[PDB]
Amino acid sequence: LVGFCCEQTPEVLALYYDELANLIEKQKGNLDLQLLDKFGKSLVEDFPNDFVVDLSPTVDGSFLFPVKSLYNLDEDETQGAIAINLLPLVSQKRVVSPICLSPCFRLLRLYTGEQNNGSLEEIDALLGCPLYLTDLEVEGKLDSLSKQEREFLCSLLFYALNWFREVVNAFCQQQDAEMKGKVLTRLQNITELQNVLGKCLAATPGYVPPPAQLQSYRPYFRELDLEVFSVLHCGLLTLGPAELCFLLDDMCWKLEHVLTFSHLCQRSPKEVAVCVVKLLKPLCNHMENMHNYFQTVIPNQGVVDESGLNIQEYQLMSSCYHQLLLAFRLLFAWSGFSQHENSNLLRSALQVLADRLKPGETEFLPLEELISESFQYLLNFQASIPSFQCAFILTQVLMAISEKPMTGWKREKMASLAKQFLCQSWMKPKGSHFNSALHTLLCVYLEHTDNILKAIEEISSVGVPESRQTFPVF
Numbered sequence: 001l002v003g004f005c006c007e008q009t010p011e012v013l014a015l016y017y018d019e020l021a022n023l024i025e026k027q028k029g030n031l032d033l034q035l036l037d038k039f040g041k042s043l044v045e046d047f048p049n050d051f052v053v054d055l056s057p058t059v060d061g062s063f064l065f066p067v068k069s070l071y072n073l074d075e076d077e078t079q080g081a082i083a084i085n086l087l088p089l090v091s092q093k094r095v096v097s098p099i100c101l102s103p104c105f106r107l108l109r110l111y112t113g114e115q116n117n118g119s120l121e122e123i124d125a126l127l128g129c130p131l132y133l134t135d136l137e138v139e140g141k142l143d144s145l146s147k148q149e150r151e152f153l154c155s156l157l158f159y160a161l162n163w164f165r166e167v168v169n170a171f172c173q174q175q176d177a178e179m180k181g182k183v184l185t186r187l188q189n190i191t192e193l194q195n196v197l198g199k200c201l202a203a204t205p206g207y208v209p210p211p212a213q214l215q216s217y218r219p220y221f222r223e224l225d226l227e228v229f230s231v232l233h234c235g236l237l238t239l240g241p242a243e244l245c246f247l248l249d250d251m252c253w254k255l256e257h258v259l260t261f262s263h264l265c266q267r268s269p270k271e272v273a274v275c276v277v278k279l280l281k282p283l284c285n286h287m288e289n290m291h292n293y294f295q296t297v298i299p300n301q302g303v304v305d306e307s308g309l310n311i312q313e314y315q316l317m318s319s320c321y322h323q324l325l326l327a328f329r330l331l332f333a334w335s336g337f338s339q340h341e342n343s344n345l346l347r348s349a350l351q352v353l354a355d356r357l358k359p360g361e362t363e364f365l366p367l368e369e370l371i372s373e374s375f376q377y378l379l380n381f382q383a384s385i386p387s388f389q390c391a392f393i394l395t396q397v398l399m400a401i402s403e404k405p406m407t408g409w410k411r412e413k414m415a416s417l418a419k420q421f422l423c424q425s426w427m428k429p430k431g432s433h434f435n436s437a438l439h440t441l442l443c444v445y446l447e448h449t450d451n452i453l454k455a456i457e458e459i460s461s462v463g464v465p466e467s468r469q470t471f472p473v474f
Contacts, residue, residue: 014099014211017043017107024110026266033115040111047108050240051089051101053425055080055129060321063092064149065134071160072130072217073189075182080130086159089131091152092368098155102162102222109170120174124418127167128182129313133160139199150200151207157197157405158209158217164190165222172231184237191243233283236290241312244287245319252323255331270341277331278349284327285355288381291320296384314429318386325393333400338414350374350401379417386429392437395444411448418445431470438473 006013020039023030033040043050059067067087074082090097098109098180112123133156145153168190171183198213208220229251232239239247258265259273295317296302301310309317337346351370354361357377364370378398385391394417402410422445426434459474 010049010095010099014103017100017103021103021106022263022266024107024114028114032116033222036111036115039107040115043104043107044111047100047104050104051086051097052084052126053088055083059087061088061092062421063087063134063152064145065153065156066134068135069130069132070134070136070302071189071193072132073185074128075128075185076125076128083132084126084129085132085162086156087132087134091156091159097159098209101115102161102211105163105166105170106223109166116175123170124179127186128179131160131163131167133157136193136196139196140203143203147204147451151204154197154200154203154207155209157193157200158207158221159211160193161190161197161217162211162222164193165224168231169223169225169228172225173227175211175231177233179385180231181237183231184239187231187239187243187247191240191246194246204234218253223227223461224254224261224268225256226264226267226272229275229280229284233280233287235283236287239253241316241320245316245323248319248323252326252330255334256326260330260334260336269336270345273342273349274345276354278345281349281352282355284324285352287320288324292381292384295321295386298429299384314386318429320392321385322387322393325390325397325408328397329393332397335405353377368407371401372407372413375410375413382417382420386443388426388434388437389422392440394421395440399444406448411450414448415445415450426467431467435470435473438470441472 006016012246016039059124061067065087067085069083071084072083076082086097086101090101091101108123108126113120116122134153140150142150142153143150164186164367168183168186171179171186174180175183194213198217201207201213201216203388208216210220212221212223228247232244232248232251236244238244254261254264255276259269259276263271292299294300300306301314301317307314310391332350333346336342347367347370350356351362353370356374357380361370361373361376375398378401379394382391385394390451395414398414398417402414406414415422418441422441431438446452449455462474
């Protein structure tokens with residue numbers, strides 16, 4: 001009927017390839033490889049000939065850009081079964097790349113995966129081979145690329161971007177520990193790619209290659225699979241201080257949209273939260289400790305001013321913290337946690353707060369016991385954080401481990417937390433977006449503190465001093 005339309009528009013071609021992704025991976029073990037004939041083996045040789053270029057040294061043709069193994073992290077051996085490159089694999093010529101390298105990349109994923117029943121080594125070296133895009137060391141090294149010499153280089157950028165994100169969504173499931181460490185190398189490559197790509201995209205505006213720098217690669221790009229967590233919550237193979245707080249804003253937006261991008265939340269809330277909170281929790285949990293013990297425990301950029309850990313690693317521990325706070329403010333107890341099944345899964349969920357504090361934390365029936373148990377190390381973390389945007393998640397987080405009532409050791413604790421964080425620094429790692437944290441904080445302290453009319457007496461102490469730009473918030 002409409003396979004002519006896939007010769008009329010490649011949009012519908014990849015869209016069939018990726019609707020086939022959806023119809024292939026969904027009932028992953030019901031729709032059958034024996035039935036897998038129509039699209040089934042329809043593009044094995046249509047996948048190689050799709051983008052698998054010839055793994056050989058010369059790059060002959062025309063472009064703004066001379067081809068290379070640019071990012072071609074071809075970790076494998078010398079027999080060149082690789083080189084499937086977005087230069088000749090799809091774009092140079094007019095267009096083949098912005099359909100299937102995302103779409104039939106996913107297609108080849110599902111097909112090669114459930115074809116031999118989980119043995120995903122068939123498509124394997126396609127990720128160990130270097131998908132050499134154009135040269136990529138200099139970014140504006142031609143700062144006159146005439147929106148195709150540079151804008152086409154950047155659409156090639158977006159192609160390498162979708163290719164990376166999809167390649168990692170492919171690889172990160174299984175881990176033969178060098179394919180696994182390989183995919184870790186891939187996520188590193190994706191971090192560097194996205195950095196340089198947003199640099200070039202910051203060059204000249206208007207570059208959305210819509211095949212699937214904050215959001216303009218975020219909705220218009222690849223699929224943050226919940227498999228992805230199974231790589232990065234796997235204990236931090238340092239990931240990095242950027243490949244945790246850049247490739248972990250994925251899991252941020254996932255919690256902040258699916259549990260308060262239609263691949264990952266095609267599953268449902270309790271169908272999902274049993275991964276994105278409980279299962280991947282202590283792995284993610286381990287990173288939390290390491291982001292204090294260096295970030296504030298021996299918090300060497302706290303007074304030492306080693307700007308590498310201050311302007312490079314600084315926002316790195318920053319990301320790790322604040323993103324860990326979205327894992328509590330949005331993830332730690334949310335607008336449907338208080339339920340029947342949400343309730344029981346939470347009682348089996350934060351009940352892994354043996355490691356939220358020191359060991360022996362899961363020996364108790366009391367839900368108030370665990371509530372104050374994740375209390376017990378929780379405000380103990382209270383001394384580390386960088387910012388009031390990063391601290392005001394501890395009001396949100398601790399109230400999330402509580403909130404039926406206030407109790408002894410909670411109104412007490414919460415008074416302590418609100419008062420300290422009120423008293424602390426807003427020292428530069430200013431406001432206009434901390435005013436929201438200020439409203440949240442003030443109305444947090446002035447509800448835990450026991451003597452209400454007294455707190456205004458403290459406000460008379462504070463008017464004796466005159467932050468005097470945030471005076472309206474107070």
